[PDB]
Amino acid sequence: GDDRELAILATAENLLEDRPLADISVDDLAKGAGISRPTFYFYFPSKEAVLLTLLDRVVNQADMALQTLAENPADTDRENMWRTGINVFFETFGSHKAVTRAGQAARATSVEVAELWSTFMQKWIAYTAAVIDAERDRGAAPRTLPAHELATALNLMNERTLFASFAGEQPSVPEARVLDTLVHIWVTSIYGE
Amino acid sequence: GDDRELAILATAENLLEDRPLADISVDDLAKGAGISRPTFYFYFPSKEAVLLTLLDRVVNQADMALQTLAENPADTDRENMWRTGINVFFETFGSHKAVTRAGQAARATSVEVAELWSTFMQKWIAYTAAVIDAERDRGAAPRTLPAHELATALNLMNERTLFASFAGEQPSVPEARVLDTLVHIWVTSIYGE
Ligand SMILES: Cc1ccc2sc(CO)cc2c1
Ligand SMILES: Cc1ccc2sc(CO)cc2c1
Ligand SMILES: Cc1ccc2sc(CO)cc2c1
Ligand SMILES: Cc1ccc2sc(CO)cc2c1
Numbered sequence A, B: 001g002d003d004r005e006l007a008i009l010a011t012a013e014n015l016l017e018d019r020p021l022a023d024i025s026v027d028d029l030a031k032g033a034g035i036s037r038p039t040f041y042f043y044f045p046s047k048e049a050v051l052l053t054l055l056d057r058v059v060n061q062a063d064m065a066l067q068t069l070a071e072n073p074a075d076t077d078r079e080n081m082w083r084t085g086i087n088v089f090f091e092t093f094g095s096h097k098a099v100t101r102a103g104q105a106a107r108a109t110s111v112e113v114a115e116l117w118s119t120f121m122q123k124w125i126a127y128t129a130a131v132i133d134a135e136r137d138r139g140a141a142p143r144t145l146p147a148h149e150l151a152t153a154l155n156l157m158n159e160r161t162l163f164a165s166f167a168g169e170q171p172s173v174p175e176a177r178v179l180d181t182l183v184h185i186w187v188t189s190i191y192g193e
Helices: A002-018 A026-033 A037-043 A047-071 A078-094 A097-106 A111-137 A147-166 A175-191 B002-018 B026-033 B037-043 B047-071 B078-094 B097-106 B111-137 B147-166 B175-191
Strands: none
Touching (some): A002 A026, A002 A037, A002 A047, A026 A037, A026 A047, A078 A147, A078 A175, A097 A111, A111 A147, A111 A175, A147 A175, A147 B175, B002 B037, B002 B097, B026 B037, B047 B078, B047 B097, B078 B147, B097 B147, B147 B175
């Protein structure tokens, strides 16, 4: 039932480790899922909708993990609080690099992919800004830039910088250094005068 | 002579304000330059090579402006020194938003476009890192992250953040606020403990 659907998704995510979506045919997905090409189309209109579903699950997995942190504060310093939260994105997207890479490509051609990404970035920026505001209200952070503008740039930094590490781009921060790098830039810019 | 070449480039940059490169034909470029389609191909192998030339000139215009700042230090504080340098990218790419937007798209499909971008980002990161190192040697900046890793993330922040402002993306920092936003994040992360 929904098992044939998982088979298509797992075949898609596995095939994206090797080649781009343009190099993957519907026949490839059906064969890997052990169904016919017409049977495929009963679960998905296109290979793009398969990628969209994959990307939706990764993004919602990150968002839910961040949701879980928010409701359970980790008893630790402010630097570590920020570290733990940025780590959700490092670990979640870093555990799904093929989908992250293919989703980024799809933003140029899929309105749904762009709108999905944009919606969750908006959500994460707003929550970053609220935490910054809370820190300012309690006197732990100085009132420097507008909180939402600062939060926007930091979250766009993470998007671009994590993606480059995962993709092995030149230039990029080494994957084993990128978390420490982003944390330093967040904490100095949030708490620095 | 080279005048027919400028006509093609100026037609291309003007046409990219209205539609993407895929929506622009070689006939459109020839007509706008007042030459035939075969005459076009004597100056350029393809419409992609036209975009590549446009992007090369914008990037080299930024790099040369940054070169000029480096050789003439502006008598001013450290915050302003960084402001003046980030402003070169704000003003140069912001004066060529159609080409900047089309060049970014081309990175996904043109090896030359990606290699051109990557080469100059490497160059600008290395120079950022040298200035950070110089500041540390003179005791003005603390020895926190590796200078080259810090410089990488800040320069990737600017790339992603300026592009989003220019493109009117959601989310983005307003174009009239993005320079102040980036400067704050650079100065706090370079000089902050
Ligand atoms: C990347 C990212 C986005 C939002 C938040 S909120 C927070 C403190 O709980 C850390 C964090 C990190
Ligand atoms: C804070 C933050 C927000 C969005 C994104 S997207 C990504 C990899 O695509 C890492 C990341 C980090
Ligand atoms: C964006 C960018 C890149 C390199 C440099 S160097 C400098 C100080 O002269 C400011 C600056 C800004
Ligand atoms: C510091 C720096 C380096 C590269 C780039 S690219 C860009 C718009 O595409 C702005 C920018 C800024």
